[PDB]
Amino acid sequence: CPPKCRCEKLLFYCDSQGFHSVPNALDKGSLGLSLRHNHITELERDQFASFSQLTWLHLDHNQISTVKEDAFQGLYKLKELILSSNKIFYLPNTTFTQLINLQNLDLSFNQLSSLHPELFYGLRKLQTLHLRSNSLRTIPVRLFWDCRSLEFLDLSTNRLRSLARNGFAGLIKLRELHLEHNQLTKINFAHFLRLSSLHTLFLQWNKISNLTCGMEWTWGTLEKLDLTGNEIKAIDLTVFETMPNLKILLMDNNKLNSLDSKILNSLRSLTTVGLSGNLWECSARICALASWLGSFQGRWEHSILCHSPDHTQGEDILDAVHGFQLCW
Ligand SMILES: *[C@@H]1O[C@H](CO)[C@@H](O)[C@H](O)[C@H]1NC(C)=O
Ligand SMILES: *[C@@H]1O[C@H](CO)[C@@H](O)[C@H](O)[C@H]1NC(C)=O
Numbered sequence: 001c002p003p004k005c006r007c008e009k010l011l012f013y014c015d016s017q018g019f020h021s022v023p024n025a026l027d028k029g030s031l032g033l034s035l036r037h038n039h040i041t042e043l044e045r046d047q048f049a050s051f052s053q054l055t056w057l058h059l060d061h062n063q064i065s066t067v068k069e070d071a072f073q074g075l076y077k078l079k080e081l082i083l084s085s086n087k088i089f090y091l092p093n094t095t096f097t098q099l100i101n102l103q104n105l106d107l108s109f110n111q112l113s114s115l116h117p118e119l120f121y122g123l124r125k126l127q128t129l130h131l132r133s134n135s136l137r138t139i140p141v142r143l144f145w146d147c148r149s150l151e152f153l154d155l156s157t158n159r160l161r162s163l164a165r166n167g168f169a170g171l172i173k174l175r176e177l178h179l180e181h182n183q184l185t186k187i188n189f190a191h192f193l194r195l196s197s198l199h200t201l202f203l204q205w206n207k208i209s210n211l212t213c214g215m216e217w218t219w220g221t222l223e224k225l226d227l228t229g230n231e232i233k234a235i236d237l238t239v240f241e242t243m244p245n246l247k248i249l250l251m252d253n254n255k256l257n258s259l260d261s262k263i264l265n266s267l268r269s270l271t272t273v274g275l276s277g278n279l280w281e282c283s284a285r286i287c288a289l290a291s292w293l294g295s296f297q298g299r300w301e302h303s304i305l306c307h308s309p310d311h312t313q314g315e316d317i318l319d320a321v322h323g324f325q326l327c328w
Contacts, residue, residue, distance in 0.1 A: 004018075012033050015034050020039050022043075039063060042067075052076075056079065080105075104128045119143065124149060125149055129150060129152065129154065130154045136160060146170055150171060186208065187203065187211055204226045213239045247270060257281050273296070276305070280307050282306035287321070
């Protein structure tokens with residue numbers, strides 16, 4: 001066992017040492033390697049050539065800025081690779097292609113601005129992919145073609161401006177998708193057509209104005225949709241016909257004015273809803289919603305208050321409806 005490193009087994013724990021590069025190990029058959037919280041700034045070719053048998057490799061919390069071609073070559077048995085909390089901004093197209101058994105890949109908290117379309121090719125056994133807290137602006141149509149077994153994808157806290165129109169291919173088994181805290185403007189739910197195993201979709205804290213659906217299709221597996229804190233003011237009358245089994249819908253902190261009876265008649269499988277913090281107009285228009293709320297038997301965590309007109313401001317939707325004879 002190499003200097004400054006304590007080894008519990010064939011696993012090597014070299015965290016918090018004053019390391020500036022990967023150490024040469026006498027023992028080459030190590031199963032794991034942890035180099036957390038060091039001062040590594042660069043990953044060389046075949047740096048891990050000695051550690052062929054490595055199954056997990058932790059390199060988080062380093063100052064890594066440059067990753068050479070073939071940095072991870074020869075690591076066929078590696079199934080977890082953590083590279084979060086570094087200064088990575090470019091990755092060569094061949095950088096992961098040898099990691100054929102990889103299962104968890106973590107690249108969050110890096111300075112990535114774009115990704116080579118073929119970056120993740122051949123990562124068939126990948127299950128979770130963490131790309132949170134990066135500066136990505138776009139995402140290649142062909143990027144996820146091969147993630148045949150991915151079921152968790154995190155693209156939150158980035159700078160995504162748009163969603164590619166024809167491209168979620170290869171994510172047929174994905175269950176949970178995080179797109180929160182980006183900069184999306186519109187949502188066309190037809191764009192998610194390929195994700196036919198999704199249970200949960202997080203879209204909170206974007207800049208979404210519109211909710212539309214261009215294709216008529218049925219998303220039977222979607223059960224939770226978090227749209228909290230957007231700028232939604234308009235919704236196409238069929239976007240929820242698409243989600244018959246939707247059970248949790250959160251639309252707090254938006255700019256919703258009203259909800260059509262056509263919309264609400266498609267939200268009958270809900271068990272939890274969120275409509276607080278909006279711009280509701282307590283006029284004759286709100287009857288569809290008022291009627292829906294009384295009929296409802298599920299949860300809402302925060303009271304849903306009227307915004308307009310001035311003499312209804314701050315009052316419960318139902319209290320205002322029955323108080324002021326707005327409906328029926
Ligand atoms: C990888 O990117 C480099 C750009 O430096 C390019 O020359 C090379 O052809 C690419 N390889 C593949 C397989 O696309
Ligand atoms: C959303 O659609 C409405 C009407 O369909 C339109 O007024 C508005 O410009 C659209 N929003 C965007 C961001 O294009």
